[PDB]
Amino acid sequence: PHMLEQYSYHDINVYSLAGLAPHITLNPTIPLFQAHPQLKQCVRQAIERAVQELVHPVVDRSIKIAMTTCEQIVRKDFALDSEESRMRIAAHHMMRNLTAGMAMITCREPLLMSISTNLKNSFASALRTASPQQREMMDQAAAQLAQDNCELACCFIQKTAVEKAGPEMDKRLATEFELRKHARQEGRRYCDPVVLTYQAERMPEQIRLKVGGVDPKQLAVYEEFARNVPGFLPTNDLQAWA
Amino acid sequence: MLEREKIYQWINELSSPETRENALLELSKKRESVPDLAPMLWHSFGTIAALLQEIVNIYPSINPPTLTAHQSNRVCNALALLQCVASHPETRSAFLAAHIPLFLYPFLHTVSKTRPFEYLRLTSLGVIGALVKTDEQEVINFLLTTEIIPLCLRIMESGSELSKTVATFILQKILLDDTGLAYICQTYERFSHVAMILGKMVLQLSKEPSARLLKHVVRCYLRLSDNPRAREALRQCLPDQLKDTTFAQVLKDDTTTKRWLAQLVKNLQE
C-alpha cells in the first residue's frame, strides 16, 4: 500500500480467534479511553466477533471468484506440459495469491463497519449513560479502533482463505491431472490437440509454447505469486410494477 | 521484422518482475499498430497471469486509498493490454470464460477522486467497453449475472465526464440487448434506480453540456421506452428538460440524437 505491510504470513495464527489478541492496537490518546480507561476491555471481543461473523462468507466468496480464473489460465498455460507437477504447483501459488487478493477486497469495508458497530454497541452498554459528548467520544473511538485494526482482521481472514484455497484448486484440476496420468498409462505424453496445432501453425517461434516444461525462466510470473501475496510482507528466508 | 522481434522480446519480458514494467510500457504503445497483439498476449506462456498479477498487486493500495500516479500508470498499461485482448475476435471469448473482468470490479468500486484513481477507473471501464463493443449476448449475460450495473450507475452519478460517458455506453449496450432490457425492467426497483440516475444526469447536462454523454443518455431512455412498464413509468418521470427546448441548441447538428429524442417522445404518447 502506502504504509508498509505490518504482518508476515507466519505472524498470525488463525487456528482460533485467539490469534488476533496479541496484535490488537489501542491508541492510548483516544479521548474515550482517557475518560474511561476501563472501556479498553471491550475492544478484543468486538474485533473477534467482527472477524467471526465475516470469515466464512468472505473465504467462500473469494475462493469462488478466484477459482475459475486460475483454472482457466493454468489449463491454458500448461496445455502442452505432460507433467502434472509443474501445473499443480503453479496453480497452487496463483490460486492462493488471487484468493488472498479477493479476500482483501471483499472484507475490508465490512470489517470496518462491523468492528466499529460492535465497539459502539459495547461502549454504549458499558456506559448506559448517553451524554451527547460521550457518544461523540464513543463514535470517535470506534472509528479509530476500526481503522487501526482492520489490517490485522483482514490478514486473519485472508490467511484462512489461502489455507483453504489450495486443496480446492487441487480438486478442480483433478481432470487435468487425470488427462496426463491416463496418457502416460497408455505410453503417450499428453498434449492438448487444439493447442498443439495452434502453437505450431500460428505462434511465432520466439513466444510459442513448447512441448514440455517451459524454460524455468518463464515461470518467473508464477514464482512471484508465491513470493508476494497481497496483504503480507513478502517472503525472504534470509414498490412493484403491480 | 526487427519491429516484430522487439515485440516478441517484450512479451517474453512480461513474466519477470525485473523487466515487466518496461515491457508493459512499450507494448501498450503498440496496440494500435500490431493487429495480432491480442492473440500473441493470450497464447504465450504466463502473459495473462502477469497482467492479473499487476492488477492484484494494486489491491493493497485501494483500501485505504493510497494509489500513486506511478502505481496507476503501471497498472493502467496492464489494463490497456487486457483491453486489447477483450477487443479481439479471437480472444474475447476466452477472456470472458476466464472471468477476467471480475478482477477489475474492485477498481470500479473505488470512489477516490484523485487523478490516479480516476485514471484507474476510466481505464478499467475501457476494458469493459471493449468487451461490449460487438453486442455479443454472451458478454451481456456475464455482465448481468456479475452485477456490474450498480458499478456503472454509481460512476454515472458521480464520476468524471469521461468516466460517465463510458459507463453510460456500457449501460446502453446492456439495455440494447433484449435480455438486458428485460433485466433492468424486471422490477420497479431496478427500473426506477436507473431512471433516477438518468434524470440526475439530464439536470447536470443542462448546466454542463456534453454532447457525447447526452447522446448515450437519450439512447438509454429511448431503449427503456421499448418496455411497456418502463414506457408507462417514463410518462410520469421523464425530465422536463427532454420535452422543452433545453437541449435544442446543442442538438442542432446532432441529427442522430435529435431523431432518437423525437422517437422517445413519440413512443411515450403511443
UniProtKB/Swiss-Prot annotation, chain A:
Where does it localize?
Cytoplasm, P-body; Nucleus
Q: In which tissues is it expressed?
A: Strongly expressed in brain, heart, thymus, spleen, kidney, liver, placenta and lung. Weakly expressed in skeletal muscle and colon.
Q: Where are the transmembrane segments?
A: none
Question: What protein family does this chain belong to?
Answer: Belongs to the CNOT1 family.
Which disease is given in the protein's UniProt record?
Answer: Holoprosencephaly 12 with or without pancreatic agenesis: An autosomal dominant form of holoprosencephaly, a structural anomaly of the brain in which the developing forebrain fails to correctly separate into right and left hemispheres. Holoprosencephaly is genetically heterogeneous and associated with several distinct facies and phenotypic variability.
Q: What does this protein do?
A: Scaffolding component of the CCR4-NOT complex which is one of the major cellular mRNA deadenylases and is linked to various cellular processes including bulk mRNA degradation, miRNA-mediated repression, translational repression during translational initiation and general transcription regulation. Additional complex functions may be a consequence of its influence on mRNA expression. Its scaffolding function implies its interaction with the catalytic complex module and diverse RNA-binding proteins mediating the complex recruitment to selected mRNA 3'UTRs.
The record's note on its domains: Contains Leu-Xaa-Xaa-Leu-Leu (LXXLL) motifs, a motif known to be important for the association with nuclear receptors.
Q: How does it assemble?
A: Component of the CCR4-NOT complex; distinct complexes seem to exist that differ in the participation of probably mutually exclusive catalytic subunits. In the complex, interacts directly with CNOT6, CNOT6L, CNOT7 or CNOT8. Interacts in a ligand-dependent fashion with ESR1 and RXRA. Interacts with NANOS2, TOB1 and ZFP36. Interacts with TNRC6A, TNRC6B or TNRC6C; the interactions are direct. Interacts with YTHDF2; the interaction is direct and promotes recruitment of the CCR4-NOT complex to N6-methyladenosine (m6A)-containing mRNAs, leading to their deadenylation and subsequent degradation.
Please identify the protein, giving its name as recorded: CCR4-NOT transcription complex subunit 1
Species of provenance: Homo sapiens
Source lineage:
Eukaryota, Metazoa, Chordata, Craniata, Vertebrata
**Which gene is annotated as encoding this protein in its UniProt record?**
CNOT1
Swiss-Prot record, chain B:
Q: Does the keyword Iron apply?
A: no
Where does it mainly reside?
nucleus
Q: List the disulfide bonds.
A: none
Which superkingdom is the protein from? Eukaryota
GO cellular component terms listed in the entry, alphabetical order: CCR4-NOT complex; CCR4-NOT core complex; cytosol; membrane; nucleus; P-body; protein-containing complex
Tissue distribution of the protein: Detected in spleen, thymus, prostate, testis, ovary and intestine.
Annotated GO MF terms: epidermal growth factor receptor binding; kinase binding; protein domain specific binding; protein homodimerization activity; transcription coactivator activity
Q: Which UniProt keywords apply?
A: Acetylation, Activator, Cytoplasm, Nucleus, Repressor, RNA-mediated gene silencing, Transcription, Transcription regulation, Translation regulation
**Where does it live in the cell?**
Nucleus; Cytoplasm, P-body
Output the InterPro entries linked to this UniProt entry: ARM-like, ARM-type_fold, CNOT9
Which regions form coiled coils? none
Q: How does it assemble?
A: Homodimer. Component of the CCR4-NOT complex; distinct complexes seem to exist that differ in the participation of probably mutually exclusive catalytic subunits. Interacts with MYB, ATF2, RARA, RARB, RARG, RXRA, RXRB and RXRG. Identified in a complex with ATF2 bound to target DNA. Interacts with NANOS2. Directly interacts with ZNF335.
- What is the role of the protein in this entry? Component of the CCR4-NOT complex which is one of the major cellular mRNA deadenylases and is linked to various cellular processes including bulk mRNA degradation, miRNA-mediated repression, translational repression during translational initiation and general transcription regulation. Additional complex functions may be a consequence of its influence on mRNA expression. Involved in down-regulation of MYB- and JUN-dependent transcription. May play a role in cell differentiation.
Q: What is this protein called?
A: CCR4-NOT transcription complex subunit 9
